[PDB]
């Protein structure tokens, strides 16, 4: 079977400044698929107020492998924010592929400073909307 081997997931969180999540709490995206017969299932998990105390000043952002047909897959990934014109900003990338076993995440605990993100001058929350962009490439 042919496979979707690279994919870009776009997710807009409305009223981002209004997120009531406390530190440690998560917003989980819808599940998206890739690979042999949509058999790789993924989602994003974001902590608007950081994963933990170390990251209390940041938004934390992770890619989760929800399920896979075998034990694992290896994948490279990149996260960025889209500005009002749909252009990528503040990208962070994994560089190498990471081992995703079923149920495991990988990402950036200190993806972006909350104060920087929330400041209207920086144009990262047009209409108070956060648009995240996740590009994934799965090792074959």
């Amino acid at each position: 079977s042919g496979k979707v081997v690279k994919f870009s997931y776009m997710w807009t969180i409305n009223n981002f400044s209004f997120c009531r999540e406390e530190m440690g709490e998560v917003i989980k995206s819808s599940t998206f698929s890739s690979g042999a017969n949509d058999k790789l299932k993924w989602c994003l998990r974001v902590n608007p107020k950081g994963l933990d105390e170390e990251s209390k000043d940041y938004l934390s952002l992770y890619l989760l492998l929800v399920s896979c047909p075998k034990s694992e897959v290896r994948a490279k990934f990149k996260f960025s924010i889209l500005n009002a014109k749909g252009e990528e900003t503040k990208a962070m990338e994994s560089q190498r592929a990471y081992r995703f076993v079923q149920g495991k995440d990988w990402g950036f605990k200190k993806f972006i400073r909350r104060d920087f993100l929330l400041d209207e001058a920086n144009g990262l929350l047009p209409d108070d909307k956060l648009t995240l962009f996740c590009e994934v490439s799965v090792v074959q």
């Binding site: 992770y62 495991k104 995440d105 990988w106 990402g107 950036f108 200190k110």
Partner: peptide, 10 residues
């Protein structure tokens, strides 16, 4: 660059 996971396992 600064990639971590919320869990770890041996």
């Amino acid at each position: 660059d600064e990639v971590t996971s919320t869990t770890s396992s041996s």
